[PDB]
Design a protein around this ligand. Structure first.
Ligand SMILES: [Zn+2]
Ligand SMILES: [Zn+2]
Ligand SMILES: [Zn+2]
Ligand SMILES: [Zn+2]
Lengths: 127, 127
């Protein structure tokens, strides 16, 4: 019901920008299309889409979570612009193997890793 | 004044545990030693120590920031137990080079990266 309707709305919203966006930003984009969705709802939907692997999530330097619906389904990571949120989907096979061997070696189970590269793209570099 | 006294208190608190701790946990350890420090203060100090590179910081799966004063000054990363917070200081030269080449290649400047491995240590694995 209001669950799948709103989920599609939020997902469709993400598909309109190539940049990572905070939940408040997404909420605003929806509010601009005349959507009656609340911020809390937007936040829950996004966190739900994140867990289902339908959108990627990452933290900004100031601790804020930002989201993005990415092109591939492949396991990947990102190089993000901390200024505009622009991002590049990146894969590092050697990082993957290193991350597995490190865990495997210290007897850790249910391994998960977070790898993200932050920088300032040329466009933003000239502010 | 109350700045350096509290900074040492919080830093000394971190040196008492080998595990990553949330700010609330640290505040409680301090409250147990009879310290009159508030949570907000504890949080600010930790964020200040983090920026100065005096303590490492990382986010847990539920978005909570946790801290740790690590053995080396060397640039390193961690394999953390999401259950107890136990951690291993790890270095990955190939990851470092990959992270530089990726940024250098897409014209990004002021590069920074975050790399952390999450798992469940044997001890916690048996709960
Ligand atoms: Zn992605
Ligand atoms: Zn940018
Ligand atoms: Zn460390
Ligand atoms: Zn553990």
């Amino acid at each position: 019901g209001r669950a799948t309707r709103q989920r599609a709305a939020v997902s469709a919203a993400l598909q309109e920008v190539e940049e990572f966006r905070s939940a408040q930003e997404l909420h605003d984009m929806l509010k601009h299309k005349g959507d009656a969705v609340g911020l809390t709802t937007v936040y829950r939907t996004l966190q739900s889409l994140a867990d289902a692997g339908e959108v990627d999530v990452l933290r900004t330097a100031e601790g804020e979570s930002v989201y993005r619906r990415c092109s591939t389904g492949d396991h990947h990571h990102h190089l993000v612009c901390r200024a505009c949120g622009k991002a590049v989907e990146v894969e590092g096979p050697a990082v993957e193997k290193w991350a597995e061997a490190i865990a495997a070696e210290h007897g850790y189970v249910n391994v998960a890793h977070t790898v993200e590269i932050f920088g300032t793209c040329a466009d933003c570099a000239g502010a």
